[PDB]
Amino acid sequence: FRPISVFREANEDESGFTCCAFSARERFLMLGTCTGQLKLYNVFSGQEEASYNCHNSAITHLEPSRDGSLLLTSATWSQPLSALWGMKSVFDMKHSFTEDHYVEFSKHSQDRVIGTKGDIAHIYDIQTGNKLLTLFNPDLANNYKRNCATFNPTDDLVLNDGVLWDVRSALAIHKFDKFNMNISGVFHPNGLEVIINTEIWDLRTFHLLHTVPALDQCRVVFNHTGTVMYGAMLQAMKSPFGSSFRTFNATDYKPIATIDVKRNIFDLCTDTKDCYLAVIENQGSMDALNMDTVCRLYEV
Ligand SMILES: [Mg+2]
Numbered sequence: 001f002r003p004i005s006v007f008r009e010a011n012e013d014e015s016g017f018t019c020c021a022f023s024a025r026e027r028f029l030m031l032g033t034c035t036g037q038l039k040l041y042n043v044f045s046g047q048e049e050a051s052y053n054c055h056n057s058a059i060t061h062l063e064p065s066r067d068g069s070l071l072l073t074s075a076t077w078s079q080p081l082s083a084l085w086g087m088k089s090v091f092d093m094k095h096s097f098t099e100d101h102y103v104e105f106s107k108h109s110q111d112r113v114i115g116t117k118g119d120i121a122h123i124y125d126i127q128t129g130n131k132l133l134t135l136f137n138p139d140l141a142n143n144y145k146r147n148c149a150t151f152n153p154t155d156d157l158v159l160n161d162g163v164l165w166d167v168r169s170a171l172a173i174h175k176f177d178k179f180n181m182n183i184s185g186v187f188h189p190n191g192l193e194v195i196i197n198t199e200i201w202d203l204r205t206f207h208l209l210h211t212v213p214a215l216d217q218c219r220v221v222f223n224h225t226g227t228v229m230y231g232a233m234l235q236a237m238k239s240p241f242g243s244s245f246r247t248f249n250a251t252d253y254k255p256i257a258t259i260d261v262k263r264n265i266f267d268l269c270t271d272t273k274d275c276y277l278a279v280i281e282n283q284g285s286m287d288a289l290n291m292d293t294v295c296r297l298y299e300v
Pocket of ligand 1: 035036037053054055056057
């Protein structure tokens with residue numbers, strides 16, 4: 001992790017970057033801010049190229065579509081709480097998700113959004129914005145405090161609150177046992193395994209494949225090739241995460257690196273070519289009057 005670049009938010013006494021994702025254009029990163037702005041930056045010079053006010057509360061998450069035409073946002077304390085934006089020709093709101101605290105695109109075909117409202121998953125059609133499906137079984141709920149619903153690589157399964165759902169049937173296939181309070185789980189890009197906190201489960205047998213102790217309380221991000229996973233541990237203005245991230249081989253789950261950047265982390269992502277890791281790092285403590293984040297770009 002050779003540091004390659006660093007930059008602070010332009011035009012701000014205290015820099016308020018909260019989240020990041022690479023754009024569909026190389027060298028240009030999308031960042032959300034604590035004032036609910038979306039920004040495009042040159043990831044080398046630190047030049048702000050464009051700004052839009054998406055929300056009147058801080059951005060907690062963004063996701064650009066692969067085709068460059070759409071963007072999902074989530075905020076901390078707004079109504080609507082999450083939204084879908086167009087970025088073709090003009091920046092405009094397409095749909096909103098009134099109380100969803102987190103949103104993701106579908107994966108194989110980006111024609112749907114999945115939102116999370118507490119323990120509940122909501123699946124929306126991108127074109128109409130209609131809510132197609134509510135996935136929630138109160139008898140199977142784990143009530144994970146950081147529940148984030150997610151599609152699998154083929155968009156035909158969902159993981160919500162530790163429950164595996166088949167999308168076509170709207171049926172719960174399996175409830176994974178609850179072994180932590182916070183982390184609800186992600187699909188491996190390989191489509192065969194889920195990763196729920198320290199447990200790696202096989203989807204074709206529901207056997208336990210691996211225990212990975214260093215994944216405890218981590219929010220997991222894969223690189224685009226699906227060969228490496230980056231975990232950033234929840235903090236035990238509060239930052240969501242602590243000051244370290246860990247990298248693992250996505251094939252055998254062996255640790256690769258543990259990096260303590262000595263600043264609390266708000267987000268991290270990779271570019272589509274997997275050259276880089278961008279991290280949002282707070283120079284200020286959780287006691288500071290104002291956050292003062294940087295984006296640091298590392299060559300992987
Ligand atoms: Mg705002």
